[PDB]
Write a protein that binds this ligand. Structure first.
Ligand code: ZN
Ligand code: ZN
Lengths: 548, 128, 336
């Protein structure tokens, strides 16, 4: 109310509200709205019932705020919330999301359009077991990947020659063709290309591949060759990975869809888009960006050894004076995978894992400025709690679970902003998309390179070109890296991110950029009696520092 | 019609440090004051070990379900291609490991964890 | 593994080789180890019970415990003295008596006592705490002498009347250290292993050492692994493979049950030593385990059985612990 509120009689105010909300704009005023307006004409007692313009303009502002939320034919108990919004209308706006809460969007080959898919948690019960994907999900996952790759290839400028589906190769011979699909080994043990139409065999004896790519099983490839019906051999003469596209050109095909929706989202009922505030937020980001710095550390910071703790203490000593905006720790937090202990005589490995994080809370006590001003991010490593329980330190499921709450009951209480996410995690800045992914890449692509019968900066160039042209974080079949059936969309590089935080302990540090995106390659947290960590300036500039 | 008034949840290859006794222990059908002590030697068992073993069994179960193969409904031949709608003959793919089986297994994990004091197992459930 | 504790030289520059580090690859060999040493030398003792840091000296005559007790301590020590008169007598030649009792800003005295014992004797140290690495890393002096660790962790307080139970624990540890060291010297002079590198419950370690040296004299790569419960294979073992996944989780065992009512007599029998008999009795297949290692292990188990038949307690214990070593992934040289 006002300083001198006067309780109203609802019947006499009824015409003033009803006229505005039922003849000019709006509809179907409820009792809650009328009671709210009673309170807020108590907040506007000044000469009211004889003063028109002030209450009328407040009502039209109310309408201008209300009519942008859904359709709003009824006014529920949110009305007080929009009135608080009215009061408040007289760094934030950035979000970090994990692979668990990413929205699902299918792709339809017959409608050439992305389709929203309801999340199982929002509509389903989810109290017993809602996280288990259905059987046909793994059937359709490769179909979805192939459809997306087909669309991406056919949108290319050069291709307007046309490829031919595999099954249409039975009746012709001694004619050149062009085709693409999954590359794998058949049951017999020969090289084959698989397509939704069918599969053929590959002749490799005279192949000249395009250099600069890691030709690996499980990767989309473009094959030009001559069919031969005497056997079933598609004699290959050239081979190249499909080209990639920048962010804006892929976006405009769907305008600007609300995939990573922070301003607005789409769901089953409606589809939403936005480009008006993109330039405004770009201009906002262009300023005070140097003040909003975020620094990342190396991989596999084991919290058991004394040397790592001492180096970390020195890093925090240098850092506490100037706390950044975001701080990220990546890699495993224990040098030995945790699993079943057959002996009760010694400390349980789970208890040791709990103990290791407890000391970190103690070390946070002497760096209060960092704990007070900078949020903290933790990303699980290859041999942390849940994975190593069944993987025992080897590669496992990629949509990895976050750090369990039961073993982090003190870090959440000491620090004020800590977020645990999956191994692939996506953050949403004002005008930037950043993704972080921690695993082993160079060794994997080196060991599984395909063989062709016939200065270290080139290897990272090949790796980046391959991972960006393929457009999928895990270009490997289900034999190598098992993936949860439904969450595969999280690993998709549909509209490629602005910056990629690609950490590989088997690769040297790099700061390359390619095709509208830039990639950073942090190394291990320590090496050769030294420790290092890197920071990235939001103005597309990078810095490297070493403190031993 | 008479049925079994209880289910089963068995942990294989359970080891006793003091006696080196190897036996499979049933968490549901077995009576109390026998889960906590070895059969031959009457020595009490560690409890967080029991919780860890249950968690490991559950996680291995989930992984095994997630890595299962696909079988055709009419002819029981196995799927041999990465992308394909259905069998060349009539019939639609079905999973080797049905969903309701693992759902019931998780239900009985829930009941077992609720009956005794098992907090880390409850946390393991909660993260799902 | 290759050299063992029984070290000797055959230089035939010894001073020049001891002012600097003596190189071993050119000159090394292992002699016989029937008797390790005639031991007559002092001992140390530092213990912790989760603020219950405790110390004792074999040649000392005082006991001080960091922050009714004295009388109970004396009576309990005397009581277990008469109750283990025989064991004390038979291990007096290892460790030998009432001592002064004390129950003691105070947390810095560990450094002082360690320094005092450092300049007082040159005495093996026995450690018993759940925080052995912490104690080693917070007392810099403890790295200057050989130490033997006897970690028996997971000790807790009853929240009431912890004095009698802790007194019992400390007194039984003190009067059983002699039997402990007797068993340790037996195992060491039987298995050619240094004292400090041994432990009471490290049966798997001796298995690894003996099997590894038997393979080293053979032409078989050891696949030795450290700080990881996976066999070493050149890095290929880090990748996920289906057959490995299925052999890892194939742990269920079948059984036979034939219900019914029986009027005939039925006998109940027990079967024991099944795994050892199974092992001793009995290119194309890629999942098969190496035949050479299997044969070597069978021969080793057979010789252990034969030696244990001829009144060897250590061989009997090894035979008993073989199965637990096989199942346990924590042991090194472990292959699923
Ligand atoms: Zn037992
Ligand atoms: Zn069929």
């Amino acid at each position: 109310g006002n300083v001198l509120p006067v309780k109203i009689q609802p019947p006499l105010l009824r015409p003033l509200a009803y006229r505005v909300l039922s003849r000019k704009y709006g509809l179907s005023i409820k009792s809650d709205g009328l009671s709210a307006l009673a309170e807020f004409v108590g907040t506007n007692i000044g000469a009211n019932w004889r003063q028109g313009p002030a209450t009328i303009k407040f009502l039209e502002q109310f309408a201008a705020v209300w009519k942008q939320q859904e359709r709003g034919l009824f006014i529920d108990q949110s009305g007080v919330k929009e009135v608080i919004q009215e009061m408040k209308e007289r760094r934030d706006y950035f979000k970090v999301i994990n692979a668990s809460q990413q929205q699902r969007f299918s792709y339809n080959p017959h409608k050439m359009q992305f389709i929203f898919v309801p999340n199982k948690k929002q509509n389903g019960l989810g109290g017993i077991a809602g996280f288990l994907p259905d059987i046909e999900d793994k059937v359709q996952m490769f179909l979805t990947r192939y459809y997306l790759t087909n669309d991406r290839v056919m949108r290319n400028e050069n291709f307007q020659m046309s490829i031919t589906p595999i099954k249409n190769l039975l009746g012709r011979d001694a004619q050149n063709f062009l085709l693409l699909g999954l590359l794998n080994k058949n049951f017999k043990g020969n090289w084959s290309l698989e397509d939704p139409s069918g599969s053929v065999e590959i002749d490799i004896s005279q192949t000249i591949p395009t250099q600069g790519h890691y030709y690996v099983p499980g990767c989309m490839v473009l094959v030009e060759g001559i069919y031969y019906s005497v056997g079933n051999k598609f004699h290959v003469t050239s081979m190249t990975l499909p080209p990639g596209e920048r962010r804006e050109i892929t976006l405009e095909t769907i305008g600007n869809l609300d995939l990573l929706g922070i301003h607005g989202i789409s769901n089953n009922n409606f589809i939403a888009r936005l480009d008006k505030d993109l330039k405004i937020r770009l201009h906002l980001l262009e300023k005070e960006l140097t003040d909003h710095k975020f620094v990342i550390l190396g991989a596999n910071l084991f919290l058991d050894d004394l040397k790592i703790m001492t180096a970390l203490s020195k890093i925090l000593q240098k850092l506490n004076d100037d706390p950044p905006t975001l701080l990220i720790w990546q890699g495993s937090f224990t040098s030995v995978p945790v699993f079943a202990s057959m002996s009760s005589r010694n400390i349980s490995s789970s208890t040791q894992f709990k103990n290791n994080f407890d000391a970190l809370a103690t070390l946070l006590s002497r760096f209060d400025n960092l704990t007070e001003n900078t949020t903290m991010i933790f990303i699980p490593g290859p041999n942390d709690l849940w994975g190593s329980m069944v993987s025992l330190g080897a590669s496992g499921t990629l949509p990895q679970d976050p750090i369990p709450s039961a073993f982090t009951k003190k870090i959440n209480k000491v620090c004020k902003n800590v977020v645990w996410s999956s191994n692939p995690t996506r953050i949403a800045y004002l005008s930037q998309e950043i993704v972080i992914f921690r695993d082993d890449l160079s060794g994997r692509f080196k060991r599984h390179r395909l063989e062709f019968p016939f200065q270290k900066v080139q290897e990272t160039r090949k790796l980046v070109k391959t991972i960006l042209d393929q457009g999928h974080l895990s270009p490997f079949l289900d034999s190598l890296r098992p993936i949860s059936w439904d969450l595969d969309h999280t690993l998709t590089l549909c509209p490629i991110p602005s910056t990629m935080v690609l950490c590989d302990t088997t690769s040297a540090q790099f700061d390359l950029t390619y095709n509208g995106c830039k990639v950073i390659n942090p190394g291990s947290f320590i090496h050769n009696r030294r420790a290092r960590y890197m920071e990235y300036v939001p103005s597309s500039k990078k810095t490297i520092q070493e403190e031993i | 019609e008479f049925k079994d008034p209880s289910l089963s949840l068995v942990v294989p290859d359970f080891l006793c440090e003091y006696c080196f006794f190897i036996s499979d222990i049933d968490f549901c059908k077995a009576a109390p004051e026998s889960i906590f002590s070895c059969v031959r030697c009457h020595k009490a068992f560690n409890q967080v070990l029991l919780q860890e073993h249950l968690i490991q069994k559950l996680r291995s179960d989930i992984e095994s379900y997630l890595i299962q193969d696909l079988r055709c409904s009419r002819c029981h031949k196995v799927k041999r291609d990465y992308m394909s709608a259905h069998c060349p003959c009539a019939g639609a793919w079905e999973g080797t490991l049905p969903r309701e089986s693992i759902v019931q297994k998780l239900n009985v994990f829930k009941q077992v964890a609720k009956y005794y004091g098992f907090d880390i197992l409850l946390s393991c459930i909660a993260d799902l | 593994m290759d050299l063992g504790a029984s070290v000797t030289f055959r230089s035939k520059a010894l001073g020049k080789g001891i002012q600097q580090g003596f190189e071993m690859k050119d000159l090394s060999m292992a002699e016989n180890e029937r008797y390790l040493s005639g031991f007559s030398m002092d001992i140390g003792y530092l213990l912790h019970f989760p603020e219950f840091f405790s110390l004792f000296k074999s040649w000392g005559d005082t006991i001080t415990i960091l922050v009714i007790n004295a009388s109970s301590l004396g009576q309990i020590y005397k009581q277990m003295f008469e109750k283990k008169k025989g064991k004390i007598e038979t291990y007096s030649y290892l460790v030998d008596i009432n001592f002064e009792f004390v129950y003691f800003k105070l947390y810095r005295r560990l450094s002082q006592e360690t320094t005092k014992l450092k300049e007082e004797r040159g005495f093996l140290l026995l450690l018993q705490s759940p925080f052995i690495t912490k104690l080693l890393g917070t007392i810099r002096l403890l790295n200057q002498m050989p130490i033997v660790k006897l970690s028996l962790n997971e000790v807790l307080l009853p929240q009431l009347n912890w004095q009698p139970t802790l007194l019992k624990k400390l007194v039984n540890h003190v009067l059983s250290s002699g039997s402990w060291i007797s068993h340790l010297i037996k195992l060491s002079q039987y298995s050619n292993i240094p004292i400090c590198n041994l432990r009471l419950d490290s049966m798997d370690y001796i298995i690894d050492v003996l099997y590894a040296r038997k393979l080293k004299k053979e032409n078989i790569v050891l696949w030795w692994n450290e700080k990881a419960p996976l066999p070493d294979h050149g890095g290929i073992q880090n990748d996920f493979d289906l057959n490995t996944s299925w052999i890892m989780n194939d742990s269920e065992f079948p059984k036979i049950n034939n219900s019914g009512v029986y009027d005939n007599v039925v006998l109940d029998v027990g079967v024991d030593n099944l795994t050892v008999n199974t092992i001793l009795t009995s290119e194309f297949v890629h999942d098969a385990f190496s035949n050479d290692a299997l044969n070597v292990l069978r021969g080793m188990l057979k010789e252990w059985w034969d030696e244990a038949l001829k009144e060897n307690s250590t061989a009997d214990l090894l035979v008993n612990s073989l199965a637990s070593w096989v199942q346990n992934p924590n042991a090194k040289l472990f292959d699923g």
